[PDB]
C-alpha cells in the first residue's frame, strides 16, 4: 500500500538530517516544557457534568437569578478549648473578632462569614442549631468570592492559612472547598511520589532490559522529551478551552510510560539491526521502518481509542483525550525524529558503556511448548476471564463525595464530623427551575399550580409535613439577578438512590402554560451526567472497535489477527474491570490500599474503556507485528508464532514492567479515581504481558494456522516485486537498452554487456542483431537485456564453478551472496576475485564481519567504493538491502567480464 513507501523515504532522511532534526525538535520540546510547567495555574476542576442537560441549565438559571449556592463553600466547626463551652462569651467576642479580621483582610476572597455565632441570642431554629445541645461545638459557614469553581478554590487556598490559625488552631474546615483542595491537591503528590519512586524504578528496567547505560538512557530521555512538549501543548491547548487537573497526571501516566515503550522499541530494533552487519545509515531506516510502522501505528491506534471518549459531554474526558493524543503522538513523533537521529549519530557508539560507569531460549521455549497443545491451555484461560466478568453485574455510578478521599484523611473527616455533629444541614435538593419564555413575572398561582404538581410526585421530604411548606422557594442572595421571569422551588429528597426515577416525573410533569421547566439540583446533575455516559457509551464502543481492528488490518495486513485482538482486547477490557469493580464496589483490597468501597464516577467509566482498549491493542501490535513480519520473510505460522514471541519477550516485559512500574507509584494516590484509574492500567496490563502474550496469543493463532494471517480481500495487499542480482547489476552496471559506447569507447549495451570492440557501429549492430537473433538497428528491450545478461550470468557461474580458487567459497554461499560474488567476478575476472583468497575463505566460512572489514581494505574498494561497499555489505547481511535502496544512480559505465555469445 501506501503507508511502506513513506517510512523508507523518512529512513533515509532522518540519516540526511541528524543534526538539524535532533535540534529542531528538542528546542520545541523543551520550549514545549518550559512553557508548560506553567500547566497547574491555568487547570480546571469542573466538567464532571453534561453541559448540555437540563440540570445544568437549571443550574446555570438558577445561579444566575437566586445567586450560586456560597452557604456550603467552607463550613467550620469550632471549638472552645479547656473544655469551655460555646456560650462563653468571653471566648465568643475573641473568635469572632478573629473572624472579622479575617474577612476584612480578604474582602475579595471570603463574602463573610454565617453563623449562630454572629448572633448568639437568636430563637432561629436553624441558627440554633449551629451549636451542639453540649454547647461544645459550633459552625460557622464562610461563603466566599468568586463566580467559577476554580476562583472560589483559589479565594478558599489564600484565605485558608489563617482560617486555620482561628480558636488557636482549634478550627476544622469542611465545605465544598477544603474538599476540593484536598482532593486536587493529590495530583501534586502523585507526580511527585512518579518522580522519587517510578523514575528509579524506569532506569533499572531500561538497564535490564538492554544491556547498556547509553541504550538505556535514550528511551528515558524520550519520555521527558514527550511529557514537556506535551505539558507545553497542553498549556496551549488551556489557551483556547478548559483543561481538567486530572489531565496532567494522565500525561505522566499515560504518555510517560508509553513514550518509554516506543523508544524501547526504536533503540531495540536498531541494536539488532547493527547485530547484523548493517551500517549505521541503513540500521536507522530499517529500524525506523519496521519499528516506526509498528510505533507509529500503535500511538494512532490509542488516538482512535481515546477519539470517542470527545463524544461524552463531560469537560473532564475532554481535557484527557487531549491530553492522551498529544503524548502518544508527540511520542510516536519523538521516537522516529529525536530517536531515530541520536541513534543515526551515536551509531555503534550506543553499546558504549556498562554497568561501571560510576560518578555519584525461554520465550523461545516457552512459545513452542504452548503451541502443540494450545487448547490445554486457550480453555482454562478464557473460563476465568469470563468469570471475572461476574462481578461486573454489581457495578455502581455516583457522584464526587468526601469518601473520595481515604479514611483517615483530616479533610474527609472534618466533613464526616460536620454531618455527624450537624445532621441536618448538608442537604442536596431537586430544584424545579420555572421560566418563562414570556418577560413577565411569575405570580403566586403560578408557583402554587407547580407546587400542587410537584406535591403530586411521592417521595420528597416532608420534615415539618405539611405539604404547603414542602418545595420551599430557593434562597436568594445578592449575586442574584432577581428577575421576577425566573422562579426556583426545591425538595430534598427521601430515600435518594431513586433520583433517576422522581427527577424523570418532574420532567413528566406538565409546566402551566407557557414556561419552561428545568429540574435541576446536586442528584440531577450527576444523574444526566450518568445518563448521559450510557446513551453515548454503545456508539464508544462502536467506533473504538472499528477505528482499532480497521488500523490493526493496515499493520497486519490479515483481517483474521486484527478480528482476533478484538475479541482478546474486549476480553482483557471485561475482566479488568469486574476485577476493579471487585476492588473498588465490593471493596476487595480497599483495607490494604485504604480506599473506601464505593459507586465510581461515570465518566471514568468512559476514560478506563478507552485507556484499556488501547493499551491492549497496542501490546497486541507489539507483538503480532513481529509474527507478521516473520510471515512475510516468509515461514510457517507455527515459527512464525514463535519468532515474534521470543524476538519481543524481553521487550514486552520490559516496556510492560516500565508502565507497570509508573502505574504502581499512582495506585497509591490519595484519590479513589485515581487509585481505579491507576489499577485498571496495572491489572489490564499484567493480564496482557502474561496471560494473553505468552499463552492466549500464540495458542489461539497456531488452531489458525495460515487462516490467522491474511485471509480473504486478495490484492488487498501488493505481492512487491523479490529482488534479483538483475536488478542489482541493473544498479551496479547500468541498464541500457541502445548500444553505447563504455568508458573504454566500446560498444556496450543491456547490463554491461560488451557487443565488441571494434571501432564500427554497424559491426556492433551486426553482431547485436546476432545475439537477439533480430534486426534490431541498436535497440533492444527490457526483456532481451535480461536474456542477455542471464547468458553472461551463466557464463559467469560456469567459469566460477571450473575455478579451483572460486568453486569452493562460491557452492557454500546462500543465493543472495552467490549474486554478489558474480557481481565481482563481473566487474574484474575470475582471476581478479580468485586474488581475494583470504576473504573468500572468510566468506567460505560465514565469517561475514571478517570478510566485509577485509574486502573493504582492497583496492578495488578504493577505486569503485560505492559499488563495493554494496557488494560488501551484501556479503555481510546476505541481503538485498544496500540495493533496494541505493543512492542515485551510477555515471560511469564499463562492459564487464564473461561477455557471452
Ligand atoms: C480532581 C478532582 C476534584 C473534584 C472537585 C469536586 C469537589 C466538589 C465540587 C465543587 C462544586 C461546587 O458546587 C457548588 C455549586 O454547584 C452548582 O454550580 C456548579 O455546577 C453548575 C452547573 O455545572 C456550574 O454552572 C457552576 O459553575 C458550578 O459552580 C450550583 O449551581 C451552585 O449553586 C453551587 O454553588
Ligand atoms: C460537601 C460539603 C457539604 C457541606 C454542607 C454545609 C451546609 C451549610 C449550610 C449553612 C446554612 C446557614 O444558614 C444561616 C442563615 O443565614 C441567614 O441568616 C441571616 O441572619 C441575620 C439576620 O437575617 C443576618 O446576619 C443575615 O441576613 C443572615 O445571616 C439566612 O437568612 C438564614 O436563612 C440562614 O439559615
Ligand atoms: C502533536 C500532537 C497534537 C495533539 C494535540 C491535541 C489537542 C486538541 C485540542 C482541541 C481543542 C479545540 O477546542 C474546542 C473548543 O474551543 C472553543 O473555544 C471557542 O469557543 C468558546 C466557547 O465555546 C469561546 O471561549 C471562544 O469563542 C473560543 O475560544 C470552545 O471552548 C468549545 O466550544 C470548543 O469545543
Ligand atoms: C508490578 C510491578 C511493581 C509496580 C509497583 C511499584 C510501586 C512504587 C511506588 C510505591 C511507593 C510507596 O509509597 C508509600 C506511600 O505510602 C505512605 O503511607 C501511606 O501508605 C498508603 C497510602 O499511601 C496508606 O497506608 C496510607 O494512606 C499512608 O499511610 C505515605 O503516606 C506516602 O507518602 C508514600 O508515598
Ligand atoms: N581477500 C583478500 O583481500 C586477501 N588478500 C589480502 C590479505 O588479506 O592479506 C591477500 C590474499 O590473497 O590472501
Ligand atoms: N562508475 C560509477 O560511477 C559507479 N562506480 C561505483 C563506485 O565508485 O563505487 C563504479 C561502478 O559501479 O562500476
Redesign the pocket.
Known amino acids: 500500500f501506501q503507508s511502506n513507501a513513506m517510512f523508507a523515504w523518512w529512513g533515509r532522511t532522518v540519516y540526511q538530517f541528524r543534526y538539524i532534526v535532533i535540534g529542531v525538535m528538542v528546542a520545541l520540546c523543551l520550549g514545549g516544557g518550559v512553557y508548560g510547567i506553567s500547566l497547574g495555574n491555568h487547570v480546571t476542576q469542573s466538567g464532571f457534568y453534561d453541559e448540555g442537560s437540563q440540570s445544568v441549565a437549571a443550574s446555570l438559571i438558577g445561579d444566575e437569578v437566586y445567586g450560586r449556592d456560597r ?2 463553600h467552607v ?1 467550620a466547626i469550632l471549638t472552645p478549648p479547656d473544655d469551655k463551652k460555646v456560650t462563653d462569651k468571653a471566648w465568643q467576642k475573641k473568635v469572632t473578632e478573629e473572624l472579622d479580621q479575617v474577612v476584612k483582610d480578604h474582602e475579595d476572597q471570603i463574602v463573610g462569614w ?1 453563623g449562630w455565632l ?2 448568639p441570642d437568636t430563637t432561629d431554629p ?2 440554633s442549631a449551629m451549636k451542639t445541645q453540649d454547647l461544645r461545638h459550633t459552625f460557622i ?1 464562610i461563603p466566599l468570592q468568586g463566580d467559577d469553581d476554580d476562583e472560589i478554590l483559589k479565594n478558599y487556598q489564600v484565605v485558608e492559612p489563617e482560617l486555620q490559625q482561628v480558636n488557636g488552631g482549634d478550627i476544622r474546615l ?3 472547598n477544603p ?1 476540593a483542595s484536598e482532593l486536587t491537591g493529590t495530583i501534586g503528590e502523585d507526580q511527585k511520589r512518579a518522580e522519587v519512586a517510578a523514575i528509579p524504578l524506569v532506569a533499572v528496567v531500561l538497564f535490564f532490559v538492554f544491556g547498556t547505560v547509553i541504550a538505556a538512557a535514550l528511551p528515558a530521555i524520550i519520555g521527558g522529551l514527550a511529557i514537556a512538549g506535551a505539558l507545553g501543548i497542553m498549556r496551549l491547548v488551556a489557551e483556547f478551552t478548559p483543561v481538567h487537573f486530572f489531565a496532567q497526571p494522565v500525561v505522566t501516566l499515560i504518555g510517560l510510560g508509553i513514550a518509554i515503550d516506543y523508544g524501547l522499541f526504536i533503540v531495540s530494533r536498531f541494536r539488532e539491526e547493527i547485530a547484523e552487519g548493517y551500517d549505521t545509515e541503513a540500521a536507522v531506516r530499517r529500524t525506523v521502518m519496521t519499528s516506526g510502522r509498528t510505533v507509529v501505528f500503535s500511538a494512532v491506534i490509542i488516538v482512535a481509542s481515546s477519539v470517542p471518549l470527545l463524544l461524552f459531554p463531560q469537560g473532564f474526558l475532554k481535557s484527557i483525550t487531549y491530553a492522551i493524543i498529544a503524548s502518544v503522538m508527540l511520542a510516536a513523533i519523538l521516537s522516529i525524529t529525536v530517536l531515530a537521529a541520536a541513534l543515526a549519530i551515536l551509531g555503534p557508539r550506543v553499546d558504549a558503556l556498562g554497568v561501571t560507569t560510576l560518578l555519584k531460549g525461554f520465550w523461545g521455549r516457552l512459545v513452542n511448548v504452548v503451541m502443540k497443545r494450545p487448547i490445554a491451555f486457550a480453555a482454562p484461560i478464557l473460563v476465568v476471564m469470563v468469570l471475572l466478568i461476574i462481578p461486573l453485574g454489581q457495578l455502581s455510578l455516583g457522584g464526587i463525595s ?1 469518601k473520595y478521599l481515604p479514611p483517615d484523611n483530616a479533610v474527609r473527616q472534618s ?1 464526616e464530623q ?1 454531618d455527624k455533629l450537624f445532621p441536618g ?2 442537604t442536596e435538593p431537586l430544584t424545579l427551575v420555572m421560566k418563562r419564555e414570556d418577560g413577565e413575572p411569575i405570580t403566586d398561582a403560578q408557583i402554587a399550580d407547580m407546587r400542587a404538581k410537584a406535591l403530586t410526585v411521592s417521595g420528597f421530604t416532608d420534615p415539618d409535613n405539611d405539604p404547603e411548606k414542602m418545595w420551599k422557594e430557593r ?1 436568594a442572595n445578592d449575586s442574584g439577578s432577581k428577575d421576577p421571569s425566573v422562579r426556583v422551588i426545591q425538595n430534598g429528597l427521601e430515600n435518594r438512590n431513586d433520583a433517576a426515577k422522581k427527577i424523570d416525573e418532574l420532567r413528566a410533569l406538565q409546566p402551566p402554560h407557557g414556561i419552561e421547566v428545568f429540574v435541576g439540583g446536586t442528584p440531577a446533575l450527576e444523574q444526566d451526567s450518568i445518563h448521559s455516559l450510557f446513551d453515548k457509551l454503545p456508539l464508544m464502543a462502536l467506533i473504538l472497535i472499528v477505528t482499532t481492528t480497521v488500523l490493526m488490518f493496515l499493520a497486519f495486513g490479515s483481517v483474521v489477527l486484527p478480528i482476533k485482538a478484538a475479541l482478546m482486547s474486549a476480553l482483557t477490557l471485561g475482566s479488568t474491570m469486574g476485577i476493579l469493580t471487585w476492588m473498588f464496589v465490593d471493596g476487595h483490597g480497599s483495607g490494604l490500599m485504604n480506599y473506601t468501597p464505593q459507586p465510581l464516577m461515570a465518566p471514568m467509566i468512559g476514560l478506563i474503556i478507552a485507556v484499556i482498549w488501547g493499551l491492549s491493542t497496542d501490546y497486541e501490535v507489539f507483538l503480532v507485528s513481529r509474527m507478521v513480519e516473520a510471515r512475510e520473510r516468509g515461514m510457517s505460522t507455527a515459527e512464525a508464532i514463535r519468532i515474534g514471541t521470543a524476538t519481543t519477550g524481553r521487550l514486552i516485559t520490559g516496556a510492560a514492567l516500565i508502565l507497570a512500574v509508573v502505574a504502581g507509584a499512582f495506585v497509591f494516590s490519595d484519590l479513589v479515581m485515581m487509585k481505579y484509574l491507576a489499577f485498571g492500567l496495572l491489572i489490564a496490563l499484567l493480564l496482557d504481558a502474561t496471560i494473553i502474550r505468552m499463552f492466549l496469543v500464540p495458542a489461539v493463532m497456531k488452531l489458525l494456522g495460515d487462516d490467522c494471517w491474511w485471509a480473504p480481500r486478495w490484492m488487498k495487499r501488493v505481492q512487491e516485486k523479490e529482488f534479483n542480482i538483475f536488478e542489482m547489476l541493473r544498479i551496479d552496471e547500468g541498464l541500457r537498452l541502445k548500444i553505447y559506447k563504455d568508458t573504454e569507447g566500446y560498444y556496450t549495451i543491456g547490463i554491461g554487456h560488451l557487443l565488441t570492440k571494434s571501432p564500427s557501429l554497424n559491426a556492433a549492430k551486426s553482431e547485436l542483431d546476432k545475439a537477439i537473433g533480430r534486426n534490431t538497428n541498436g535497440v533492444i528491450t527490457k526483456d532481451e537485456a535480461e536474456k542477455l545478461f542471464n547468458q553472461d550470468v551463466d557464463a559467469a557461474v560456469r567459469g566460477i564453478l571450473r575455478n579451483a580458487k572460486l568453486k569452493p567459497v562460491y557452492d557454500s554461499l546462500d543465493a543472495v551472496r552467490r549474486a554478489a560474488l558474480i557481481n565481482m567476478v563481473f566487474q574484474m575476472g575470475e582471476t581478479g576475485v580468485a586474488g581475494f583468497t583470504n576473504s573468500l575463505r572468510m566468506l567460505q566460512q560465514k565469517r561475514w564481519d571478517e570478510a566485509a572489514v577485509n574486502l573493504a581494505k582492497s583496492r578495488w574498494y578504493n577505486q569503485t567504493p560505492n559499488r563495493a561497499k554494496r557488494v560488501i555489505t551484501t556479503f555481510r547481511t546476505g541481503t538485498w538491502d544496500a540495493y533496494e535502496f541505493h543512492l542515485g544512480g551510477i555515471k560511469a559505465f564499463h562492459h564487464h567480464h564473461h561477455h557471452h555469445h
Open positions: 452557604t456550603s463550613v454565617v454572629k448572633a436553624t441558627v459557614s469542611a465545605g465544598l474538599l468526601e466533613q460536620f444541614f448538608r434562597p
